[PDB]
Amino acid sequence: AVKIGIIGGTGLDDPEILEGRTEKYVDTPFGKPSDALILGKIKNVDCVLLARHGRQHTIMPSKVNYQANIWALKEEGCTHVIVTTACGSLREEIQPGDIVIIDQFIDRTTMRPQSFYDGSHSCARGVCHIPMAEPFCPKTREVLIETAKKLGLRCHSKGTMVTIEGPRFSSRAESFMFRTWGADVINMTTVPEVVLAKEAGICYASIAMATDYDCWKEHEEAVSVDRVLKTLKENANKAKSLLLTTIPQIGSTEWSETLHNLKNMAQFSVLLP
Amino acid sequence: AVKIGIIGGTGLDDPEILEGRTEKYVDTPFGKPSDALILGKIKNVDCVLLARHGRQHTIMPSKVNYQANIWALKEEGCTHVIVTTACGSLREEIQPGDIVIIDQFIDRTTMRPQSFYDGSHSCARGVCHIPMAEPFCPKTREVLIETAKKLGLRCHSKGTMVTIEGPRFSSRAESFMFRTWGADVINMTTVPEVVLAKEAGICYASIAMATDYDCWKEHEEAVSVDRVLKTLKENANKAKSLLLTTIPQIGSTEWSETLHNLKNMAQFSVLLP
Amino acid sequence: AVKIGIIGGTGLDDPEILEGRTEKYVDTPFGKPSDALILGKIKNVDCVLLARHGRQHTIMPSKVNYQANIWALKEEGCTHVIVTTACGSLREEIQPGDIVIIDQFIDRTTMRPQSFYDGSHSCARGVCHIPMAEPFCPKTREVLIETAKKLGLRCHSKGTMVTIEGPRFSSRAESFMFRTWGADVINMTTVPEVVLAKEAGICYASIAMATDYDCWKEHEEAVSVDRVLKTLKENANKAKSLLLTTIPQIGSTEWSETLHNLKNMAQFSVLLP
Numbered sequence: 166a167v168k169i170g171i172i173g174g175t176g177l178d179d180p181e182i183l184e185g186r187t188e189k190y191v192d193t194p195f196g197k198p199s200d201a202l203i204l205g206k207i208k209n210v211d212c213v214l215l216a217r218h219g220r221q222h223t224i225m226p227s228k229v230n231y232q233a234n235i236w237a238l239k240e241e242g243c244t245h246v247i248v249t250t251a252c253g254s255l256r257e258e259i260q261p262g263d264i265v266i267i268d269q270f271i272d273r274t275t276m277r278p279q280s281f282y283d284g285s286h287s288c289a290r291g292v293c294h295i296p297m298a299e300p301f302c303p304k305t306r307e308v309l310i311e312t313a314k315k316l317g318l319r320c321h322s323k324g325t326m327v328t329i330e331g332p333r334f335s336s337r338a339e340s341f342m343f344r345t346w347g348a349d350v351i352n353m354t355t356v357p358e359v360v361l362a363k364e365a366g367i368c369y370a371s372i373a374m375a376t377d378y379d380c381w382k383e384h385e386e387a388v389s390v391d392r393v394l395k396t397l398k399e400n401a402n403k404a405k406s407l408l409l410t411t412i413p414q415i416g417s418t419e420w421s422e423t424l425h426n427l428k429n430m431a432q433f434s435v436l437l438p
Numbered sequence: 439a440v441k442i443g444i445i446g447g448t449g450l451d452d453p454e455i456l457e458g459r460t461e462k463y464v465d466t467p468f469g470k471p472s473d474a475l476i477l478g479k480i481k482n483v484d485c486v487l488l489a490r491h492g493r494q495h496t497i498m499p500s501k502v503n504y505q506a507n508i509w510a511l512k513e514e515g516c517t518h519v520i521v522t523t524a525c526g527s528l529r530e531e532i533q534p535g536d537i538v539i540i541d542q543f544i545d546r547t548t549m550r551p552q553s554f555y556d557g558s559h560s561c562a563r564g565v566c567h568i569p570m571a572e573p574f575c576p577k578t579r580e581v582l583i584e585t586a587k588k589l590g591l592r593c594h595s596k597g598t599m600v601t602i603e604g605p606r607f608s609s610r611a612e613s614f615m616f617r618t619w620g621a622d623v624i625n626m627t628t629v630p631e632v633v634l635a636k637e638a639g640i641c642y643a644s645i646a647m648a649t650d651y652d653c654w655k656e657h658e659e660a661v662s663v664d665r666v667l668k669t670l671k672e673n674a675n676k677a678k679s680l681l682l683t684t685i686p687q688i689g690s691t692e693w694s695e696t697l698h699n700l701k702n703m704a705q706f707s708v709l710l711p
Numbered sequence: 712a713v714k715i716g717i718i719g720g721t722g723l724d725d726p727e728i729l730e731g732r733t734e735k736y737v738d739t740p741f742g743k744p745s746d747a748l749i750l751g752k753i754k755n756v757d758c759v760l761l762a763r764h765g766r767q768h769t770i771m772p773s774k775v776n777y778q779a780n781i782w783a784l785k786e787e788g789c790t791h792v793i794v795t796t797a798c799g800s801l802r803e804e805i806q807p808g809d810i811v812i813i814d815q816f817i818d819r820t821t822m823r824p825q826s827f828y829d830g831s832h833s834c835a836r837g838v839c840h841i842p843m844a845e846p847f848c849p850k851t852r853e854v855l856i857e858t859a860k861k862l863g864l865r866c867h868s869k870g871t872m873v874t875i876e877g878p879r880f881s882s883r884a885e886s887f888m889f890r891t892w893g894a895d896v897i898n899m900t901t902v903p904e905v906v907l908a909k910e911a912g913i914c915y916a917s918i919a920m921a922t923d924y925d926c927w928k929e930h931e932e933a934v935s936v937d938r939v940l941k942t943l944k945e946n947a948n949k950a951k952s953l954l955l956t957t958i959p960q961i962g963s964t965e966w967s968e969t970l971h972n973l974k975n976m977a978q979f980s981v982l983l984p
């Protein structure tokens with residue numbers, strides 16, 4: 166019974182990838198999601214699409230309701246969440262237009278709730294300490310990696326995403342610092358989205374698309390809103406094709422054991438009185 | 439006139455270490471403490487015990503009322519605060535079950551008030567900039583170190599605690615990063631507890647107990663709630679014995695000069711109009 | 712039509728540098744500024760002075776209304792904002808009393824709005840991602856540097872400011888860590904002041920004055936409120952003279968192209984629906 170949540174990021178807020186589309190606005194105990202859920206199918210696989218920033222990109226990264234978004238997808242029955250995220254490259258070999266199937270993060274966010282279990286919601290009682298050693302589902306990641314290869318897409322098989330609070334871009338001193346820390350790409354949205362997915366027992370993976378070299382690299386176009394959007398206009402089709410081709414493979418794979426183990430990890434992370 | 443505040447952490451929320459126990463719920467200008475104060479004695483030394491997370495461990499690290507807890511202990515007349523804190527080890531030589539008498543911290547918290555002087559409480563007026571060069575009382579630390587030796591306990595005489603916001607555990611990229619920064623142990627509660635104690639002119643020290651190797655070290659059991667609680671079940675007695683044996687020594691030592699200097703540092707850190 | 716906003720920091724809250732002073736309390740959509748605007752002149756150049764902490768230094772760094780302060784200065788017609796900031800030195804060669812014309816920052820703040828565009832103010836609609844590759848105006852910085860030389864003042868031509876949340880000073884482990892990161896000076900106020908200035912299309916520069924060596928350097932007086940204020944009492948005249956001599960030079964320079972480019976950068980950083 167797989168059902169794939171898709172969270173569309175910058176330049177991919179509402180990708181025309183689902184057949185048999187039906188719009189459904191929902192509510193959650195953590196408030197309204199960013200926008201309507203878009204229910205549909207890719208081949209015979211049920212999907213639920215959601216614009217991270219709203220379909221008109223009106224919500225800045227700090228104000229995205231990550232709890233509501235993940236809650237809504239889980240409540241709709243999603244077993245997996247595969248997302249897109251635009252990002253800056255911190256490595257020469259990760260070129261604008263490249264995809265990075267990230268496997269780690271470094272949190273630089275400051276303003277964001279990272280748990281459903283805040284002691285104020287009867288829907289999630291207790292104190293939850295979710296493990297983050299392996300934040301992304303390696304089985305989903307492996308299907309994304311193999312599919313990118315079949316599509317002939319420049320794709321990096323791992324990567325560490327530094328997530329900054331924003332909405333400003335980083336200073337040059339910060340950009341260089343993140344490089345010394347071993348971060349490979351930079352964005353504003355991976356945390357706490359990945360964390361809440363893990364608490365929900367969902368297989369989560371991220372299609373990171375490099376759009377710029379932040380501001381560390383000489384003789385490159387400086388990061389700006391226009392530069393990010395231009396790179397996505399040129400390359401977003403690659404993410405769309407990757408989703409379209411990956412999802413049927415996920416639908417034909419066995420997931421019960423993977424999902425059971427995630428459910429157990431999430432369940433045993435909650436300390437009750 | 440020494441009086442010892444004891445803040446019990448994970449696996450030590452309400453240790454049966456006090457004789458002549460009396461429960462006392464209090465209020466403060468910063469709200470209610472985590473739980474009732476437990477008044478009692480160790481030998482002839484007055485103590486005040488307080489569960490950091492509540493005695494049923496119902497309060498997550500971000501939501502702990504650090505201001506109320508420290509305010510309540512100070513108002514009850516505590517000259518010292520000695521705490522327990524479970525932690526992950528970031529160093530091969532700090533094994534689960536080891537005690538670390540930490541002497542430094544690196545703040546990674548984001549959500550927490552760190553001062554009594556926020557411009558909104560008539561009980562603490564002015565702008566306070568407390569020094570943090572020596573965050574922990576070295577005289578109290580030295581008694582803990584010497585007592586641990588007398589007890590034959592594996593104990594490290596110093597250490598830098600990185601305090602993360604939580605409630606999630608760290609990613610592997612974060613865990614490795616904290617190691618490059620020179621942090622020795624990792625927790626979610628040292629900051630701002632140590633900071634507020636200093637503002638209150640209290641001699642503060644911390645008994646850190648390693649419960650796991652976070653997620654950096656191969657061929658070790660991964661950090662999880664169950665793994666932390668299991669290690670504490672096995673080793674909490676060591677912290678209990680250390681408190682029981684240390685406190686009488688503190689009670690027989692001269693503290694007026696130490697306390698006067700702390701009072702002065704706290705007093706001179708407040709800039710009034 | 713240049714008009715110079717001056718934000719006075721610690722030890723320089725209300726410097727007697729303006730002729731023809733008129734006090735003007737204003738309001739903004741983000742609340743009240745720290746204090747009254749002080750309108751006046753230096754030679755024939757219009758200025759607007761504002762105490763960052765209030766003229767009685769009653770507002771701690773976390774509670775400073777950076778949005779209101781920058782909004783008020785922009786609304787009064789300021790083309791430039793030149794500020795003073797006291798700071799700790801993280802480098803042997805930056806001595807207490809030295810000026811540093813900082814050119815980069817590393818953000819360690821956690822509690823502060825960094826944008827006017829938070830989705831809640833009709834005065835600033837949209838999602839704004841301001842570039843921070845060059846956070847400070849290099850043309851203003853160059854005039855400050857050349858003027859400091861003409862005055863014979865010990866002045867460093869660049870520097871990376873780490874801005875901590877405060878109000879506590881850093882621990883020793885933190886102080887050493889910031890040195891490994893390549894930060895040169897440390898304060899509590901550069902972020903988000905510099906960020907909001909950029910969003911407002913204002914030429915912003917900072918006169919950083921070292922007052923101490925934080926707590927990393929042996930055989931120096933430990934940072935404290937008294938030590939900072941003492942160094943500023945001795946050296947604040949240098950910042951005052953630098954402002955007084957710089958501002959007339961700014962007034963006689965051509966700025967239309969510089970200001971146009973800043974306006975464009977700010978304008979194109981806003982994504983509308």
Ligand SMILES: CSC[C@H]1CN(Cc2c[nH]c3c(N)ncnc23)C[C@@H]1O
Pocket residue numbers: 175226250251252253254329334335351352353376377378379380388389390393394840982
């Ligand atoms: C409409 S452009 C801004 C959006 C794109 N997001 C990702 C991103 C691309 N390049 C980045 C960089 N150099 N640093 C941090 N983030 C990013 C961030 C924001 O949501």
Ligand SMILES: CSC[C@H]1CN(Cc2c[nH]c3c(N)ncnc23)C[C@@H]1O
Pocket residue numbers: 294436448499523524525526527602607608624625626649650651652653661662663666667
């Ligand atoms: C009921 S277990 C979770 C509680 C124990 N606290 C300390 C701690 C042990 N191991 C840690 C690690 N690897 N990283 C961060 N913190 C810790 C954190 C939390 O209050």
Ligand SMILES: CSC[C@H]1CN(Cc2c[nH]c3c(N)ncnc23)C[C@@H]1O
Pocket residue numbers: 567709721772796797798799800875880881897898899922923924925926934935936939940
């Ligand atoms: C009244 S003294 C405190 C004020 C001076 N500000 C700057 C500063 C000087 N030395 C610093 C250091 N070692 N670390 C961080 N900041 C500073 C901070 C605060 O507003």
Ligand SMILES: [Cl-]
Pocket residue numbers: 273546819
């Ligand atoms: Cl950080």
Ligand SMILES: [Mg+2]
Pocket residue numbers: 319320
């Ligand atoms: Mg290849």
Ligand SMILES: [Mg+2]
Pocket residue numbers: 592593
């Ligand atoms: Mg030994």
Ligand SMILES: [Mg+2]
Pocket residue numbers: 275276277548549550821822823
């Ligand atoms: Mg915060």
Ligand SMILES: [Mg+2]
Pocket residue numbers: 865866
């Ligand atoms: Mg010189």
